[PDB]
């Protein structure tokens, strides 16, 4: 797998600019937080509700162990 | 699945089995001379194991 042996492609053009013709940070916090808020609204409905099921077992699991030693 | 069963692989398993057994009894009796299994050196008493 070397570079001129990977695939076969036709009719595609690429334009690129030098690293010395570009400023370092084009859009940092005017575009940064509406892009992160898009990726947070997507994958927090798959990640977070499994971890609140651990929480309700933890808070119930140390409210039975502390009534297991008293009256 | 249906990739695996038929009249081919199990008749390739027919002459396999003697191979499997003498691949298994190789592993059975071969393990006992390396790790000093004293519970199976008793069963054939002709081999003086440790002095």
């Amino acid at each position: 797998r070397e570079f001129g042996h990977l695939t076969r492609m036709r009719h595609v053009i690429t334009y690129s600019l030098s690293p010395f013709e570009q400023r370092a940070f084009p859009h940092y916090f005017t575009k940064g937080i509406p892009n992160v808020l898009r990726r947070t609204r997507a994958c927090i409905l798959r990640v977070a509700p499994p971890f609140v099921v651990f929480y309700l077992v933890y808070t119930w699991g140390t409210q039975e162990f502390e009534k297991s030693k008293r009256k | 699945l249906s990739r695996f069963l038929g009249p081919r692989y199990r008749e390739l398993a027919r002459n396999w089995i003697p191979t499997a057994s003498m691949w298994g009894a190789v592993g059975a009796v071969g393990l006992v001379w390396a790790t000093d299994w004293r519970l199976i050196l008793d069963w054939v008493p002709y081999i003086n194991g440790k002095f």
Binding site: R1, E2, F3, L6, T7, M9, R46, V47, P50, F51, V53, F54, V57, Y58, W60, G61, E64, F65, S68 | T35, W37, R38, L39
Partner: protein
């Protein structure tokens, strides 16, 4: 006449690290494989200094460890690097396994199978080294393990008699726990070079699962600089724990010397063995515990055979990743239960969550990959 392409040594470096075709959209989760090779070289250098001053003798071993922390120059910073540089190895290892499970990377079958061998040899090396300080947690963790190793019906009772040196606990007892602990990290190294000889046949996977032979970039300069940035961010967080709270992760009871005439209030392993200890105590038998222990690490080899989806990665599979984080939130529950007393609530939770670890991998995952195929019209 490019010397980077024709020199016998330099060709191998150029093919593997410089001119290698790499996908262009590789994210931050591909950095933790080189962080495992950083954590491994650090534990080998720090461990060779600690071996020059240690004495394996059950009378003089707790005192050999205090001698480096109070007399030897830099001995307090090198010892607490080692105890904390093994917690960093294990946090990088669990992120690395969860990456390859999420993006379907187990389809590189020869690469994935050597990985499951690396997960056993790492978990066994960190066990032999924790018994070596010889305190009240080092003694009462080794006699819990060897009880579950003399329950194997045909080899079990003569095997624990060999590792203890033929006796219970004397000078020639810790000589065999120390010898296997010196040797196995140099076998983890050789198994990691064979690990990357099999990844070179296909190159890397990418977050989309789709092949990427149209859109390759070279590895240097794009990922030689992105990995260096991640390795310096790791040494920042590591040296925060050595110099600001070096006793945050350990246990105080291992500062009491080993004496069977007294008894500790609890038995508690390190944080990274607590999921495997909540499964031993969940089965009330010494045979169904040593079998449910090894089934929790050997179940990774069935992951290539249980895949029934048309797609490789979980990026476009939203019901399959809803079950990926139920599996992560269940190894958290098995880590909290694993450091509790064996009482009323901590056993109904310890066994209803040792079941759910096996029901998700073996049953609930392959059935949900089929419902996804049926809704995409295959």
């Amino acid at each position: 006449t490019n010397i980077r392409k024709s020199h016998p040594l330099m060709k191998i470096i150029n093919n593997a690290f410089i001119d290698l075709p790499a996908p262009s959209n590789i994210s931050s989760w591909w950095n933790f494989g080189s962080l495992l090779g950083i954590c491994l070289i650090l534990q080998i250098l720090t461990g060779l200094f600690l071996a020059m001053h240690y004495t394996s003798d059950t009378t003089t071993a707790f005192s050999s460890v205090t001698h480096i922390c109070r007399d030897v120059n830099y001995g307090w910073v090198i010892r607490y690097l080692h105890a904390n540089g093994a917690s960093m190895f294990f946090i990088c290892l669990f992120i690395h396994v969860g990456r390859g499970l999420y993006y379907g990377s187990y389809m590189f079958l020869e690469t994935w199978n050597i990985g499951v061998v690396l997960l056993f040899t790492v978990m066994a090396t960190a066990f032999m080294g924790y018994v070596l300080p010889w305190g009240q947690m080092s003694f009462w963790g080794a006699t819990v393990i060897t009880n579950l190793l003399s329950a194997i019906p045909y080899i079990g009772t003569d095997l624990v008699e060999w590792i203890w040196g033929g006796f219970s606990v004397d000078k020639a007892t810790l000589t065999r726990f120390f010898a296997f602990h010196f040797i196995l990290p140099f076998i983890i190294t050789a198994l990691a070079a064979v690990h990357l000889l099999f990844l070179h046949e296909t190159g890397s996977n990418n977050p989309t699962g789709i092949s990427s032979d149209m859109d390759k970039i070279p590895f240097h300069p794009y990922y030689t600089i992105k990995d260096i940035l991640g390795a310096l961010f790791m040494m920042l967080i590591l040296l925060i724990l050595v110099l600001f709270s070096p006793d945050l992760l350990g246990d105080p009871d291992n500062y009491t010397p080993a004496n069977p005439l007294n008894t500790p209030p609890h038995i508690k392993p390190e944080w990274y063995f607590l999921f495997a200890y909540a499964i031993l105590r969940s089965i009330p038998n010494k045979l169904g515990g040593v079998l449910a222990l090894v089934a929790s690490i050997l179940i990774l080899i069935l992951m290539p055979m249980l895949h029934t989806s048309k797609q490789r990665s979980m990026m476009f599979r939203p019901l399959s990743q809803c079950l990926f984080w139920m599996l992560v939130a269940d190894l958290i529950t098995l880590t909290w239960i694993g450091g509790q007393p064996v009482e009323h609530p901590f056993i109904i939770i310890g066994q209803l969550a040792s079941i759910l670890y096996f029901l998700i991998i073996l049953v609930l995952m392959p059935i949900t990959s089929i419902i996804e195929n049926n809704l995409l019209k295959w």
